Amino acid sequence: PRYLKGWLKDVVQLSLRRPSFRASRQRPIISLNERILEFNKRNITAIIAEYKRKSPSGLDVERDPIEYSKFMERYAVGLSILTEEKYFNGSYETLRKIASSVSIPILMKDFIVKESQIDDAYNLGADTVLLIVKILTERELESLLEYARSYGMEPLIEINDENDLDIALRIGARFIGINSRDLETLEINKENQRKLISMIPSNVVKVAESGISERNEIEELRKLGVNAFLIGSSLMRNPEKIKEFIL
């Protein structure tokens, strides 16, 4: 990885020592980005529901994974499951169980720094994976992307600034997530996010991440060309809220 400070440095060390998951994939790869594109064509708001009982920017919310999943399977274009243990209280089992209960695409949200973590996602049932530009080097980012593509997955490559955007385009990314929240400081900056969104070529599928609480934010981001929206916190407290962003 790159040189990191604070929690990002710690979570990365945990991830390097994260034990591999040994079992075989049951389900098929259900492409998330392609499903986002089809929803776009059918003019259905594409929302990615995130399941996380804990995070650095929030209070803990206990909720049953399977129930959340089965309910979202009716509304969301896909699911984003946190599997990072320490700061997000996620686990592999929770993903394994959910992947078996639903048939919509699943994104494994974790701090992927080695290839075995992509093997895990594959074996656990995830259809795709999140790659974070700021913790990885250009070389690493390129290999992991290629390694995920060999599995038939198109990773969601998360950016946060122009530096990140440059690299993302350079390594040939086609599925990018613009995070409004700076992972390091946990600060949200929507102006910077709208700036980046307009610098991304029309052909790449754009997912807006973080800071969405109202349906009109979605409509505005949408006129800017954003394809999908990843919403977590608000949905964990009141799942039903999805019916409101979705109309």
Curated annotation (Swiss-Prot):
Gene3D superfamilies to which the protein is assigned, alphabetical: Aldolase class I
Gene (UniProt): trpC
Protein name: Indole-3-glycerol phosphate synthase
Entry's family note: Belongs to the TrpC family.
Single Gene Ontology BP annotation: L-tryptophan biosynthetic process
EC number from the UniProt entry: 4.1.1.48
InterPro entries: Aldolase_TIM (IPR013785), Indole-3-glycerol_P_synth (IPR045186), Indole-3-glycerol_P_synth_dom (IPR013798), Indole-3-GlycerolPSynthase_CS (IPR001468), RibuloseP-bd_barrel (IPR011060)
Pathway note: Amino-acid biosynthesis; L-tryptophan biosynthesis; L-tryptophan from chorismate: step 4/5
Species for this entry: Saccharolobus solfataricus (strain ATCC 35092 / DSM 1617 / JCM 11322 / P2) (Sulfolobus solfataricus)
Highest classification ranks of the organism: Archaea, Thermoproteota, Thermoprotei, Sulfolobales, Sulfolobaceae
Subunit structure: Monomer.
Superkingdom classification of source: Archaea
HAMAP family in the cross-refs: IGPS_A
Entry keywords, A to Z: Amino-acid biosynthesis, Aromatic amino acid biosynthesis, Decarboxylase, Lyase, Tryptophan biosynthesis
Molecular function, one GO term: phosphoribosylanthranilate isomerase activity
Catalyzed reaction equations: 1-(2-carboxyphenylamino)-1-deoxy-D-ribulose 5-phosphate + H(+) = (1S,2R)-1-C-(indol-3-yl)glycerol 3-phosphate + CO2 + H2O
Transmembrane segments: none
Sections of the chain in a coiled coil: none
Keyword Amino-acid biosynthesis: yes
